[PDB]
C-alpha cells in the first residue's frame, strides 16, 4: 500500500 | 464543519465559499500532484462527511479518479462493516451516503465522540494516495539529469517523483543512495563519485553548483 | 440563512455578497455542468426560501432554463399540496399555520414565517424542501444540456485509456445528473467502446474487476 | 444597516466596502438588465434609508435613470403623505432627505417597528422596475429566431426580453403560447407546429435539439 | 404598472 | 472608527486595510468625479478625526487638491472657533474640555479625547463635523474639476435622447456637486439644447411633464 | 497587535495576511513616496515591536533604506537609554531586539501602560521621514511648468515634491508665495502676475484653466 | 493555531485558507529569497506543529529543499533528545508526558497533546520550538540559494551609489540569511568595491560615518 | 530635522 505524501509530520 | 464557538460549544458551520473555491482551484491547477492531498486535508479541517462529499462532488473533471475514489471508499466501508458489525454508524453512515447531517453532528459531538468525519477523510486520503501514485507521469528510474540541466532542478524532479511514488522511507533512502548519484550527467556524476560515501544532499548540491 | 449565534440561538442573517457573487459566477462560467448542482447545494446552506429565490433571481441568463425550473417548482408545490394539505380552519393561539406549496417556495410566506417554520421544535425544513425541488429542476436542466451521448464516447486509436474514461464518466454524469453509474450495461458499454487492444486486455482481466485494475492493465 | 447582534440586540452596522463595490460593479457591468433589481434587493438587506441613498449615489453614470428614480421616489413620498398626513415619519423622512440616521434607527428598531428602510426600498424598486421596462432594447414582437441560431438561444432572448418587459403572468403565458412558436425559424417552427397544442417548454426545446 | 422581475418568490 | 461591540459598548477599532485600499483606489480611478464624495462618506462611516486624516493622508496624488482641501478645513475650523469658542479656564474634575477648530480636525487632539467626545452623553460628533468640512472641500474640488460646462451639452443630430440626458445631468452634477438640480433654468436649458425634432415634441408635451414622459416621447 | 476584545479585555492578535500583503505591495508599488508613511502608520495600528519588525523585515528590496532605518533606530534607542538609564524597557526592548512578545504585551497592557509599540513606531517613522526626504527625485527649485503642461499637473508635482522635502510650514508657504508663481510657463505666469498678491491656490488654478 | 477567544480561553482554530494560499504563493513567487523567512514566521503565528507541517506539506516544488529541511529538523530533534530527554516511566495521573524530538515535530504527537503542551501552565511552546528548527533549515536553504557572492558586487562606472548599496546589502542578506551585517570587513568591502570617485569621497569622510552620510556624500 | 508627511492632522 502507498506510504503517503505528508513529508513532514505523520 | 464542526467548530468550537467562543462559548465553548461545538456548533455546525456552513462550508465557506472561500474554501469551496480553494479546493476547486487546487484540483484545477495542480491536477493530482502530491501537494494536493495535504491541501485537501487542510481545507477539510473539522469537516463532516457531508462537507467532504461536497468538496469531492464540486470537482468537474477527473471523473476517472473520482470513480476510483468511490470504489476505494466502498472497500474501506466494507472493511469497517466487517470490523464493526443513539444508532451506531455503519460504513454507509460514515461516508454520508445513508446518514443525515444531524446524525453526523450527533456522532461527532457525542461524548465519547465518534469521529465519522476523520474516518471518512482517512478513507478519502487513502484513495487519493492510490490515485496520485497511479498518476505519476514518470518513474524514478527514468529521472535523469539532462545534459544542460542544473543539478538543483534534477534533484527537484527526483524527489518530486519520489514523493509521488510513495514508498517506504527505506526504499526512498535506498533510491537516493545509488539511483540519485548514478543518473546525474557525466560532470556532476564524476564530482559526486569524487566526493565520497554518505554525503548529505546539501553537500552534493554544493559540489555541483 | 438561519445560522447559530455564539449564544446558541438560531438567528437570521442577510445573504452574503461573497455567496451571491459566487453563485452568479458559477452559473456564468460552468453554465449547467453537473458540478454546478453540488456547488449550489453548498452555497445555499442553511438558506431560507427567500435566500433561494434570491440566488435564482440574481441569475441573469439562461432564462428559458429558469422557466423550466419554475415549472418544475410549481409541479413539486402541487404535489406537496396533494400529499400535504392544510386544513382550512382556525389555528391555536400559540401555534403557527401549516405551509402550502406556495409557502415553501417563499412566494406566499414572509421571512418571519419561514424563520418560525425552520426554527420550530420539531422543525419544518421549508428551506431544505424548496432546495430539493430546485435541485430536481436543476437536475432536469443539466440532463437536457448534455452535449453528447454516452454512445458516442469511444476510445481514440492512439488515445490514452485514462482520457477515454474521463470523457466517458463525464458524459455519463452529464446525461444522468449523477455519479452513481455502476450498471451492468454501463460497464459493458465502457469495455465495449474501448479500442481493440485494451478491449482484449480488459476481457482477459475477468469479470468484476475494479476500475483501478482496468486502468492499470491499459497503462 | 440594522443587524441583530449575538446578544439578541438590533444594532447599526456600517455599510461594507464589499457591498459598495458589489453594487457599483453590478450597475457598471449589467447596466439595467432585470437581474440588477434582485441583486440590489439582496445587497440592501437590513438597510436604512441612508444606506439606500449611499448605494444609489455611488452610481457614477446613468444619471437619466437616477433622475427618473428621484421623480418616482417623490411620487411615492407624496402618496405616502396623502395616506399618512417619537415623531411620525413623513414622505421625506422615509427617503432619508429630512430624517437623521438616529431617527431612522429609532423607527426601524421601535416596538412596533416602523420599517422605513423597507418602504424606501419598495419605492426604489418600483422606480427601478419602470427604468428596466423602459430600457429594454428590443420588444418581444421583434424577438425572432435567426436562421442559423440555436433554439435554446432564441428562447433565452425570448424570456430575457419577456422578463424585461414585466407584464402580468397572463400576458406572459399568452405571449409564449403563440408568439413563441410563430417567431421560430421555418424548421423548428414546422417541428413545433407538428408537436401539438399545450406542449411544455422542455418538450419544445427537446424537439428542436 | 410593471409586474416586477422577481421570477421566483414574490 | 467607533463601532459598537456585541456587549453594547462603543469601542475604537483600527481602520481596516480593505477600507484604506478602497479609498485609495477610488481616488486613483475616479479622480474627482462626483460619485467619489458619496463613496468617501460611506467609507468614513463612524470614523474619528484620526481616521479621516488617515484616509486623506494616504492619498498620494492630487496634492494641489489636498492643499485646497487643507485651506478649506482651516477656514471651517476658524468659523468653528468663531461660532463655538471655548472658555479659557478650569474644567470640572469629572468633565472633558471643549473642542477647538484644531481639536475637531484631529491636529491638536489625541485619539482618546476624540473617543470621549464621540461617546459622551450627550455625544459631540467631532468625526461627523470634520467629515462635513472635508466634504465641503471635496465639493469645491469636484466643482473645479468639471471638464465641460452645461451650456456646451447639446443633443447630437443622430444621437439618442437618452445619451444626451445622461451627459446632461452628469455634467450638471459635476458642475454643481449635487444631483438635486430641478431648476426652471436647468429644465428650460435641457429642453432647449435638444435637437429640433425632440424639441418640438417636448414643447408639445406641455409644461411640468416628468422626465419619464419626456424620454418616452423621444424614444 | 494588541486589540480590545468584545469582553473589554486587551488581547494579542496575530498580524493578518491581508495586512502583510498590504504593506509589501505598498513598498513595492509606491517605493518611498511620501504617502507610504501614512499607510504604514495605518497598517501598524495597535502593533507591538515584533509586528513592526515583521512589517519591515518582509520588505524584499530597498536594503539601503532598511540599513539606514536600522541606524536611525539605533540612534533613537541610544537617546532613549540616555533619557531612561516588572522590568523597565531599554532601547533594545522597545525595538524588539532584546525583548520577548510576552514582555511587550506586558508593558503595553500594564496599568499605567508603557507604549513600546508607539515609541518604536515613532522611531521608525522618523527614519522613514529621513529616507523619503533623501529619496526625493527632484528639488522644488527644478519643478517648472513645462511649455505644454497643464497648470494642475505642475502644481501637483510642485506640492508632491514639497511634501517629499518635508520643511516647516513657514518654508513651504514661503516657497509657494514666490517660487510657485515664478516657475510657471510664460502664459500662466503673466496671468498669475496679473492676478495680484495673496491669491489663493484655487484662484491661481482657476485663472490658468 | 492556538488563538484566544473573547471568553479569554486559548482554543484551537483550523488553519485558514487565506494563510495556506498566502504561504503557497510566497514560496511560488519569492522562491527562497530572504524575505520569505520573515513572512513564514508571520504566517505561522500561534501555529501548532500540525499547522507547521501543513504549511510545509502544501509546498509542491523545491522538494530537494524540503529534503534538506527535513534533515535539519531531524538533527534539531536529535539535539533536543540529547539536551532534553524524557524519563521512561510512569506519569502522574493529573500531568501530561514530556515531548520528545518526534513529539515537537508533530510526527508522534496528536493535536490534543500539542494543544495541552502549548496551553499548559507553565506552557511548553512546542510550536515555537519546531518553528525555530524550521527557520534554521530555511536559513540554510536561503544561504545555499544565494545567486552571487558579495565579492562580485561592485559599483558600476556610471551606476548610482544607491543602487550599488541596494545590491550590496541584498546580496549580503542572501549570503548570510540576516540583515545585521555591520562588520569591519563588510564595511571596508563596501567602501572598497565602490567606484574610484565615491571611494575617495568616502575615505575623505572619515572613519565611522553613518550610511546616511555616506549616501549623502555620493549623491 | 524633517517635518513629516502627514498633511492632515498631526
Ligand atoms: O420525506 C421527508 O423526509 C419529509 C417528511 C415530512 C415532511 C417533509 C419531508 C421532506 C423533507 C424532510 C426533511 C428534509 O430535510 C427535506 C425534505 O424534503 C422534502 C421534499 C419533498 O418534495 C417532500 C417532502 C420532503
Ligand atoms: O448644526 C448642528 O447640528 C450642530 C450643532 C451644534 C454643534 C455642532 C453641530 C454640527 C453638527 C452636528 C451633528 C452632526 O452630525 C454634524 C454636525 O456638523 C457640523 C458642522 C459645522 O461646520 C458646524 C456644526 C455642526
Ligand atoms: O532556550 C529556551 O528558551 C528554552 C528553554 C527550555 C525549553 C525550550 C527552550 C526553547 C524555546 C523556548 C521558548 C520559545 O519560545 C522557543 C524555544 O525554542 C527552542 C528551540 C530549541 O532548539 C531548544 C530550546 C528552545
Amino acid at each position: 500500500s502507498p506510504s503517503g505524501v505528508f513529508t513532514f509530520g505523520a | 464543519p464542526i467548530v468550537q464557538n467562543l462559548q465553548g460549544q461545538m456548533v455546525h458551520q456552513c462550508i465557506s465559499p472561500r474554501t469551496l473555491n480553494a479546493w476547486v482551484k487546487v484540483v484545477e491547477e495542480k491536477a493530482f500532484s502530491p501537494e494536493v492531498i495535504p491541501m485537501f486535508s487542510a481545507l477539510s479541517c473539522g469537516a463532516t462527511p457531508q462537507d467532504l462529499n461536497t468538496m469531492l462532488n464540486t470537482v468537474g473533471g477527473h471523473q476517472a479518479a473520482m470513480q476510483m475514489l468511490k470504489e476505494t471508499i466502498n472497500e474501506e466501508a466494507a472493511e469497517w462493516d466487517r470490523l464493526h458489525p443513539m444508532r451506531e454508524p455503519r460504513g454507509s453512515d460514515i461516508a454520508g451516503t445513508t446518514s443525515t447531517l444531524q446524525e453526523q453532528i450527533g456522532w461527532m459531538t457525542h461524548n465519547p465522540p465518534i469521529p465519522v468525519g476523520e474516518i471518512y477523510k482517512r478513507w478519502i486520503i487513502l484513495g487519493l494516495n492510490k490515485i496520485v501514485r497511479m498518476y505519476s507521469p514518470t518513474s524514478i528510474l527514468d529521472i535523469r539529469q539532462g545534459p544542460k540541466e542544473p543539478f538543483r532542478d534534477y534533484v527537484d524532479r527526483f524527489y518530486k517523483t519520489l514523493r509521488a511514488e510513495q514508498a517506504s522511507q527505506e526504499v526512498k533512502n535506498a533510491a537516493t543512495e545509488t539511483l540519485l548519484v548514478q543518473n546525474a550527467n557525466p560532470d556532476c556524476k564524476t564530482i559526486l563519485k569524487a566526493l565520497g560515501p554518505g554525503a548529505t544532499l546539501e553537500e552534493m548540491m554544493t559540489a555541483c553548483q
Side-chain angles (χ1 to χ4, degrees), chain A, chain B residues 1-147 149-209:
Chain A
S1 59
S3 53
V5 302
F6 287 83
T7 314
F8 305 84
Chain B
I2 304 302
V3 295
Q4 192 190 78
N5 70 346
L6 313 188
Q7 295 298 332
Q9 308 168 336
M10 302 301 288
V11 307
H12 173 72
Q13 273 193 340
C14 289
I15 181 167
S16 171
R18 180 80 64 166
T19 301
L20 293 166
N21 190 75
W23 174 237
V24 172
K25 297 308 183 192
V26 171
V27 180
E28 288 180 1
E29 296 172 47
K30 297 272 174 294
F32 280 91
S33 188
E35 60 261 32
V36 173
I37 292 174
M39 187 61 70
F40 175 79
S41 180
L43 299 174
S44 59
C45 175
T48 71
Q50 185 199 1
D51 302 334
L52 299 167
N53 291 327
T54 292
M55 293 181 65
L56 302 179
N57 292 342
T58 55
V59 181
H62 306 101
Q63 291 301 309
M66 303 298 91
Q67 291 292 325
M68 286 175 60
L69 185 62
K70 266 171 157 53
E71 291 182 345
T72 302
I73 293 169
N74 288 328
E75 300 174 345
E76 297 297 344
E79 183 62 9
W80 174 269
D81 286 336
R82 188 182 74 85
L83 296 173
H84 302 63
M86 186 190 69
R87 181 183 60 175
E88 287 292 66
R90 290 179 58 86
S92 299
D93 293 321
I94 295 174
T97 308
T98 58
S99 65
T100 58
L101 173 57
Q102 194 60 222
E103 295 176 357
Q104 301 166 359
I105 300 167
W107 287 312
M108 294 169 59
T109 57
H110 185 263
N111 186 21
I114 301 169
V116 298
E118 298 298 337
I119 298 164
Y120 193 21
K121 184 162 66 180
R122 202 173 299 154
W123 305 344
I124 292 167
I125 285 176
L126 288 167
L128 292 181
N129 292 341
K130 305 170 83 198
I131 296 166
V132 172
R133 186 164 90 274
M134 174 177 291
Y135 285 11
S136 187
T138 307
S139 180
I140 194 72
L141 304 170
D142 296 329
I143 298 294
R144 321 190 193 281
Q145 182 174 355
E149 181 184 3
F151 186 62
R152 178 158 53 200
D153 303 23
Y154 157 72
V155 295
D156 280 347
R157 299 189 301 98
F158 192 87
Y159 289 109
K160 186 70 175 297
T161 308
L162 207 65
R163 188 189 191 187
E165 290 184 351
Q166 304 180 46
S168 65
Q169 185 62 45
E170 292 78 8
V171 175
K172 292 180 174 174
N173 288 331
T176 179
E177 303 201 67
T178 61
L179 193 57
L180 183 278
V181 56
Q182 89 176 27
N183 291 339
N185 61 7
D187 306 271
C188 180
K189 182 174 176 177
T190 53
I191 301 171
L192 255 56
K193 285 185 174 180
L195 269 165
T200 63
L201 182 59
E202 189 181 10
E203 293 172 336
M204 297 181 178
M205 300 183 70
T206 302
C208 297
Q209 191 167 19

